[PDB]
Amino acid sequence: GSSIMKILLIGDSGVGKSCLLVRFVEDKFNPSFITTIGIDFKIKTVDINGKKVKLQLWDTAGQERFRTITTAYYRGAMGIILVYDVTDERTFTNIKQWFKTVNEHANDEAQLLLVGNKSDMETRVVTADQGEALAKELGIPFIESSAKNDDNVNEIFFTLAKLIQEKIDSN
């Protein structure tokens, strides 16, 4: 019932883009269509620094079909999270690409964010420094976490929130 903020998750499959949301939002009743529709939308009122802001987040299976629409999500994103798994290397690679894909449609006044996930298992074929490299090459912040500790998960989002909120105060 206040200030809105559109957020979306970009990345490949396996990355755990889903689980991160399930975990980010505390709801057992809310259903999951991402298995069937290939899309799933979720609101979550969050705050920091006395700000009643509601987060809207899209999670897509990318899959062809409604791509015509999932595409309309970049056009609206107020912030977007580029995500990758650190136990898979081919996961890391594509990030420059998705990033390109984001500059195309994402009204680049969008708050991007590198996100190294699944740092649970320690098949960690990538390191924190590696990711902070691309992030610095891209000119966007970075973080990590693992929905197996509920650690940094909330940070992941609270971060984007401020970055977005402030980029709104310079105005």
């Binding site: 009743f29 809310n30 259903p31 269509f33 939308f41 609101i43 629409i69 309309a72």
Partner: protein, 93 residues
């Protein structure tokens, strides 16, 4: 044969021209129209591709509650079951 056919021909060409010339003045305006369309048509396909999200949002938002509201109303009965199973849990003994 000669002068006759010529003046006849000239009169014929004379017409064919007034034809082509009108046809042209018409295509000229048939564009102005077929353009005022591509104009709108292209705007719309835009207005649409814009509005999509906000629309599919509300679709999902409603679908959520539908399954949610349902699922909660079950949970509650699950709770009840458990409690009745705890009431007759004592009575028995």
């Amino acid at each position: 044969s000669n002068y006759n056919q010529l003046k006849e021909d000239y009169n014929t060409l004379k017409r064919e021209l007034s034809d082509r010339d009108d046809e042209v003045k018409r295509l000229r305006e048939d564009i102005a129209k077929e353009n005022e369309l591509r104009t709108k048509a292209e705007e719309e396909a835009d207005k649409l591709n814009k509005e999509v999200e906000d629309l599919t949002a509300s679709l999902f938002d409603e679908a959520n509650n539908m399954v949610a509201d349902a699922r909660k109303e079950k949970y509650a009965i699950e709770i009840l079951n458990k409690r009745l199973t705890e009431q007759l849990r004592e009575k028995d003994t």
